[PDB]
From a paper:
[name] ([name]) is essential for schistosome survival and a validated drug target. Instead, both these activities are provided by selenocysteine (Sec/U)-containing [name] ([name]).
To increase aqueous solubility of the compounds to facilitate structural studies, the cycloheptyl substituent in [name] uncompetitive inhibitor 8 was replaced with a sugar moiety, resulting in compound 9, a noncompetitive inhibitor and thus capable of binding the enzyme in absence of NADPH. After structural refinement of the X-ray structure of [name] into the cryo-EM map obtained at 3.6 Å resolution (as estimated by the gold-standard Fourier shell correlation at 0.143 Supplementary Fig. 25 and Fig. 4a), additional electron density ascribable to the compound is present in the doorstop pocket. In both conformations, the pinane ring of the compound interacts with F324, V469, T471, A481 and L484 in subpocket C, the indole interacts with F324, G325, P439 and L441 present in subpocket B, while the sugar moiety, through its hydroxyl groups, is close to the main chain carbonyls of G323 and R322 in one conformation and with the analogous groups of G437 and Q440 occupying the hydrophilic portion of subpocket A in the other conformation. The cryo-EM data show inhibitor 9 bound in the doorstop pocket, indicating that the design strategy, based on the initial fragments found in X-ray co-crystal structures, is successful. We propose that this class of inhibitors trap the NADP+-[name](H) species, preventing NADP+ release.
Author numbering:
A (entry chain A), B (entry chain B): 6 to 598
């Protein structure tokens, strides 16, 4: 029965009020708690499906079945009459003072998932502490609250990709009858950086206002967990303190990697420096083939620069290789020099940085290919998106047993639960689960719901749709072609593929039959769609809806019976019939396939 | 069981071939037919639910169980031996090209649905004649083959839509570090006309090539049906001739109506004369509140010319009124006059059309509101968009019984079947079926499959999503708020609403909280999503993705389970929690809901 739910609720949370809609006394005590400015995790028993076992559990634990029953921090206050009596002597504010632990919940790391979990816990009754600190970049750049995705990540990346799309739109406007010259239009990088930084500062201020509104104690200081309840604090003023708390959330997030080569740390930069540096990188070298490196090089090239991507092994490792190759070809066509199959060796400085003149320095790069030829070049800026490593060592010494591989930090089971019962890890921390922003937010929210509200729903991690914001976006949800062939077998996987030219590219005279599209359908499950991909403009908007459709298993016949929206670039999804098994070329020019 | 499929196939389809995969003789006869360039509508017996029933029906009709069996007009030629002997004697072409009717299929109306049906029937082993003709009742520009959607309706609409969005993009490029002024930049409307007409001509050439490939004969002749198996046609040179056919497909479509008053025909223009108009309309009056009228007015306004919409009763009749008002306000905020609750009385001329230098002549408009106020203004052009009506009287003889309402339309049953057994109506004339291009295309393709290949699946006209390409696009799927309230009552309908802001509008300092999202769900069936609505940039892609999601039974909990794509607009649908019953303001700025 609901014995497990009652045990989970009573052993956690701050205040939980069991009530029903029919009983007027329950509504009265709810109103009394509301007018006292007391946040509570009320539960409606009548509307809950298991309306019988809850009464038995209440009789077993509270020794009384008369709802409403309000419970605080391991202490049973009593019925509505008891709460009214406590408020009569003005002790209701006094009795809501948490417990032996200083905080109901402490989040280490003010990232998107961390802040979402903090807000979710705060609006469910508990008093929450949030601890966010950013170790300064070796160059010296620093950002405020918001985490990686917000401060230096999702938002600035999309803003600069939109700038690149505007750059292409300037080219297309001449073919669209607008009196303007591409030779007479130039990009002011500094103004763009100032604007995006102003927007991100506004976002940080809004986040601070929101967190202080939910009665959440935020301290900008490094946190280091000592025991499953105790954590030490290193303030920016080196004022080390110590706070205890029953519930701990680990949201240390992630920090960009460096290659252990001479001169990389003191001369190179990462995404942390890229999104806030004043000058313009110009002739730029990018190290690493992760999707972040590719999109960064993409919108640096689209903004007048001439970037050289230096791929080590393969473009977009972990993604589908066919559309990875297509994306690389598109970058090559628009002025991106791909130094594939090469490995960096060392870097040096030739001309010192010119921060007084706001000009980038000059850096010499030495590397070697797979055959060891001495690759030599000079660049005005070198960016190291070689990967990302988490610094869980300096936040957890030996308290929790967390297995970690290369690029991994912890081992975690379902319900984001680690080995320690009262320690929870969300966001990028969990290994073997996607490192995305919405998944982190959902994990935090659902963790707060399960802890301080008694919820039973568990956050999903499968079929997580992603989109990379290259000059032309790539959005995928599900499985790749190679992954499907490896898992379900070559003969059990059917791929529906096509090439389409968006209606926005006709008069503009852009490239035709480049925007690719593919499906992954398995015959054993009635042509069930497994991996759905799109490559072209606004790929994320197209991909999100079809990810939603895939979530509960949309079949190929479902796509066939669905009717398109005219005119849109996504139409060809509901008109997919070409098969790779037949080998028919998907080059659709003029008349649609 | 399969008797009905067999009888409809033999009595309707042209060339049929019952065969299996395991039998090698069937593959041999397939190869023989392929070498003879005689395409066939083959059916794989071993790839169907009940092969034994098909074999029993064949024994009841073909008298022999041994597959394969090839049929022409349903006649039993025989087995593979008979077909091989006939091919050796070299008279199979005459056998397959002889019948009591001149053509197997006659399709009147060369629209997207018409060409789709023609190609689907042709590649399914049949001979078909597609007849299209356009009668320019106004001064007119007789566009070639391509139908309403391609020649006039859809493609030019989205082309000038992207022109308007490029106008907005140049306006907003100031904040993205682009060195221009938006004052020295002007517009070239003639460039619009020439480019869009060039693209239309390329599409027409592609369509002609496609119809030539599918061996379909196309004659630009007026269609006028006579008897259930014969039609008399009028060539371009007034050469009246007579053609008989086995089956008839009606795709007459519709043409814009006219508010018949003196001068409304010889002076004003409609959408037919809008997408090829040599001169820029400039200060324009728009008549009617249909989505075409608002789309055209927004196009001209964002292009630069001030426009005055003149709404009779309500904006966007048939859509949700809330977003209708929102979209109207969005045009109003960008310089679109709105003479709401007004109807026209007369139009006259002051200056003749100045065609020597391509300048529009001046016109005077007189009308009255609901209170009789004498509205009196001057416009050098008036565009009449008061809906479209079909000319069945010019295509269909009165001897056959059909139904027409005030707006026209043709009565028809579920399987696109008219009163006559071999006369079929698809496109914009079906009784109660949506007036959309994919509707016509799917209806034509599925009808051809059900006719000349014995298909079973029917085209779906339910939950047909749409998108109107106003300057702020509006895309909806399912139902509306008022429709849901009428259907199930207030207590059974729950609305989730959100006011969001695209990331592309942050630096640009565009409108905030203007964008909108609405979700209509029914409580009695597990919060099943009925009507979903989006109002923002690139709404068509989101709307189609979510229409595909909804069509196969998507609930709100399914939306919650989905992990969003960050950063885009569409993932805001996965964070829908505000309810209209609670009355919380949709406006979220920093917390973003
Ligand atoms: C350039 C770039 C682009 C990206 N684009 C996308 C994208 O489009 N979509 C997407 O889904 N994801 C994207 N990501 C990933 C995204 O940054 C993460 O997935 C997301 O931030 C994870 O959420 P979080 O709550 O862990 O936030 P995080 O930012 O990962 O949380 C880390 C925070 O905790 C703080 N912290 C760390 N250790 C401590 C400690 N001991 N004490 C106190 N505070 C501490 C850090 O200072 C930081 O503020 C991108 C990342 C980068 C670098
Ligand atoms: C301004 C405008 C915008 C539109 N935008 C959209 C949109 O965004 N999305 C969408 O889905 N739909 C849109 N439509 C609708 C779309 O144009 C039509 O619904 C589409 O053409 C339907 O296909 P059809 O079979 O009716 O072809 P149609 O082209 O409508 O009809 C076939 C053609 O045959 C002609 N014809 C008539 N009688 C005869 C005869 N006796 N012999 C020969 N030919 C004849 C007709 O005039 C017509 O041109 C729009 C329409 C207009 C006017
Ligand atoms: C669906 C989509 C589509 C795009 C490709 C991969 C997925 N998203 C990218 C991605 C997500 N993880 C996540 O970290 C590792 C795991 O923790 C997690 O399972 C995984 O989702 C990656 C890791 C390396 C490399 C790329 C990724 C594809 C085609 C299957
Ligand atoms: C989903 C969407 C959303 C937008 C509204 C209607 C649907 N599509 C618009 C529409 C489709 N028909 C079609 O022609 C008439 C009928 O033939 C057909 O049934 C109808 O779908 C219209 C007619 C007049 C006016 C608008 C329309 C709404 C809110 C339910």
């Amino acid at each position: 029965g609901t014995s497990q739910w009652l045990r989970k609720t009573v052993d956690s949370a701050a205040v939980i009020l069991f009530s029903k809609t029919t009983c007027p006394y329950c509504k009265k005590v709810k109103d009394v708690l509301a007018e006292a400015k007391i946040k509570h995790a009320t539960i409606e028993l009548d509307q809950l499906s298991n309306g019988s076992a809850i009464q038995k559990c209440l009789a077993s634990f509270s020794k009384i079945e008369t709802v409403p029953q309000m419970f605080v921090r391991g202490k049973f206050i009593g019925d509505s009459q008891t709460v009214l009596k406590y408020y009569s002597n003005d002790e209701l504010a006094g009795i809501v003072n948490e417990s032996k632990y200083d905080y109901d919940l402490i989040v280490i790391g003010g990232g998107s998932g961390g802040l979402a979990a903090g807000k979710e816990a705060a609006k469910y009754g508990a008093k929450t502490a949030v601890l966010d600190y950013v170790e300064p970049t070796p160059i010296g750049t620093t950002w405020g609250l918001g985490g990686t995705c917000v401060n230096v990540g999702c938002i600035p990346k999309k803003l600069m990709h939109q700038a690149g799309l505007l750059s292409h739109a300037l080219e297309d406007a001449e073919h669209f009858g607008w009196s303007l010259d591409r030779s007479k239009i130039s990009h002011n990088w500094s103004t763009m950086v100032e604007g995006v930084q102003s927007h991100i500062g506004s976002l940080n201020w809004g986040y601070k206002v929101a967190l202080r509104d939910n009665q959440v104690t935020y301290l900008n200081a490094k946190g280091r967990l000592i025991s499953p309840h105790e954590v030490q604090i290193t303030d920016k003023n080196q004022k080390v303190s110590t706070i205890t708390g029953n519930k701990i959330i680990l949201a240390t997030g992630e920090r960009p990697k460096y290659p252990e080569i001479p001169g990389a740390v003191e001369y190179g930069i990462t995404s942390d420096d890229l999104f806030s540096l004043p000058y313009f990188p110009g002739k730029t070298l990018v190290i690493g083939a992760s999707y972040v490196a590719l999109e960064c090089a993409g919108f640096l090239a689209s903004l007048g620069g001439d970037v050289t991507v230096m791929v080590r092994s393969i473009l977009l490792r972990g993604f589908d290789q066919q559309m990875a190759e297509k994306v690389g070809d598109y970058m090559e066509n628009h002025g991106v020099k791909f130094a594939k199959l090469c490995v960096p060796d060392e870097i040096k400085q030739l001309k010192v940085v010119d921060t007084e003149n706001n000009k980038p320095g000059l850096l010499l790069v030495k590397g070697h290919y797979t055959d060891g030829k001495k690759f030599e070049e000079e660049f005005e800026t070198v960016i190291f998106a070689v990967g990302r490593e988490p610094q869980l060592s300096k936040v957890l010494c030996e308290t929790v047993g967390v297995k970690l591989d290369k690029n991994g930090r912890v081992v975690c089971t379902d319900d984001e639960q680690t080995t320690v019962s009262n320690v929870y890890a969300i966001g990028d921390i969990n290994a073997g689960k996607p490192q995305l922003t919405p998944v982190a937010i959902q994990a935090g929210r659902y963790l707060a719901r399960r802890l301080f509200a008694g919820a039973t729903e568990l956050t999903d991690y499968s079929n997580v749709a992603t989109t990379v914001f290259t000059p032309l976006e790539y959005g995928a949800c599900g499985l790749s072609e190679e992954d499907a062939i490896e898992k379900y077998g070559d003969k059990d996987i059917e791929v529906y593929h096509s090439n389409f030219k968006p209606l926005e590219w006709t008069v503009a005279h852009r490239e035709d039959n480049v925007c690719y599209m593919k499906l992954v359908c398995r015959k054993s499950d009635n042509m069930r769609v497994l991996g759905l991909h799109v490559l072209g403009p606004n790929a994320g908007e197209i991909t999100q809806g079809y990810a939603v459709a895939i979530k509960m298993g949309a079949t190929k016949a479902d796509f066939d019976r669905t009717i398109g929206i005219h005119p849109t670039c996504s139409e060809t999804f509901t008109t997919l019939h070409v098969t790779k098994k037949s080998g028919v070329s998907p080059i659709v020019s003029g008349c649609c396939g």
